[PDB]
Amino acid sequence: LSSEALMRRAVSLVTDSTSTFLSQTTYALIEAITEYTKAVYTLTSLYRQYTSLLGKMNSEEEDEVWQVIIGARAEMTSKHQEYLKLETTWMTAVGLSEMAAEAAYQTGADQASITARNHIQLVKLQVEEVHQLSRKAETKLAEAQIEELRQKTQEEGEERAESEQEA
Amino acid sequence: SEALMRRAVSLVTDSTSTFLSQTTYALIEAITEYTKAVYTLTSLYRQYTSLLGKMNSEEEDEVWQVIIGARAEMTSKHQEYLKLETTWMTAVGLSEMAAEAAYQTGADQASITARNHIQLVKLQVEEVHQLSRKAETKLAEAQIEELRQKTQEEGEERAESEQEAYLREDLEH
Numbered sequence A: 001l002s003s004e005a006l007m008r009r010a011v012s013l014v015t016d017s018t019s020t021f022l023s024q025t026t027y028a029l030i031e032a033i034t035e036y037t038k039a040v041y042t043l044t045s046l047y048r049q050y051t052s053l054l055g056k057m058n059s060e061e062e063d064e065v066w067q068v069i070i071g072a073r074a075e076m077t078s079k080h081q082e083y084l085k086l087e088t089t090w091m092t093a094v095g096l097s098e099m100a101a102e103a104a105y106q107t108g109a110d111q112a113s114i115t116a117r118n119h120i121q122l123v124k125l126q127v128e129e130v131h132q133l134s135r136k137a138e139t140k141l142a143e144a145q146i147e148e149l150r151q152k153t154q155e156e157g158e159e160r161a162e163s164e165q166e167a
Numbered sequence B: 001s002e003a004l005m006r007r008a009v010s011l012v013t014d015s016t017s018t019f020l021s022q023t024t025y026a027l028i029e030a031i032t033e034y035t036k037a038v039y040t041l042t043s044l045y046r047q048y049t050s051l052l053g054k055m056n057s058e059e060e061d062e063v064w065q066v067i068i069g070a071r072a073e074m075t076s077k078h079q080e081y082l083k084l085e086t087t088w089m090t091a092v093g094l095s096e097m098a099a100e101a102a103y104q105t106g107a108d109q110a111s112i113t114a115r116n117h118i119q120l121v122k123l124q125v126e127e128v129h130q131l132s133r134k135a136e137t138k139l140a141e142a143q144i145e146e147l148r149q150k151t152q153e154e155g156e157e158r159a160e161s162e163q164e165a166y167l168r169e170d171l172e173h
Helices: A003-052 A059-106 A110-166 B002-051 B057-104 B108-171
Strands: none
Touching: A003 A059, A003 A110, A003 B002, A003 B057, A059 A110, A059 B002, A059 B057, B002 B057, B002 B108, B057 B108
């Protein structure tokens, strides 16, 4: 084959292989953000349960619920860290596919170039959507934590006031 | 799975290596064709110098026409090598980012391999580049020599033609 045919053959393999790597890393990242989002919802549920139990637990039971919350936080943290690692690799996969698209363009393989660029846009949209879902969960967690603190503050103020008047 | 990702990374490093190889060959060949076209123009200028004082205006105009042709060719080879130089730059960057993907996914052997390949091809291209730069310097040398000697020959002809104008006038008292 001619030099230009050899360059086109080679760039086609580069675009196919970087497309595959981008798809795999996108799938893994989306799965990891999903698992983190589930852990955020679990913790949010725990804060809400804990809030509903305030005033209603002996000191040992309260300590035990708090330990479960500490454990649920560890799980959420570990899932967050795992997705951040995968997201780092995914960013490299996106840059590789961008460079592959430029190589395809420069060699005159325009269909490979445009298809790669469409693929990068699609996976960015997909990752943005899963991030939006995660932020919805994080908002609910923040709300739950704020309500717990607001209630705990009221509880401690009530218990002070009781202790004083009792005395 | 990390299994599927290391397989795909291995295909990325292999394919980017193949593209880097092929673009390196294409660029070396293009720099070579340009250097040959520079060498041709240099030889033509040198020949023009060697012919000063031995040509009439008709022959000299033909020499210059051939030089203009050779210069057009050199320019076309220049454009083509800069086009391949851009493609090669992109190949090098692809391989660097492949080496980074490999490192991040635990494919440490593939990462080192890619970096060594980049260094080898960079060395080779740099050397072929240096050859072209030397050729360019030789062309500039030959053009300076030719224009200096052309200016001198013009002086010589003007001296002769003035002298012979007097000598004719002298005869027709």
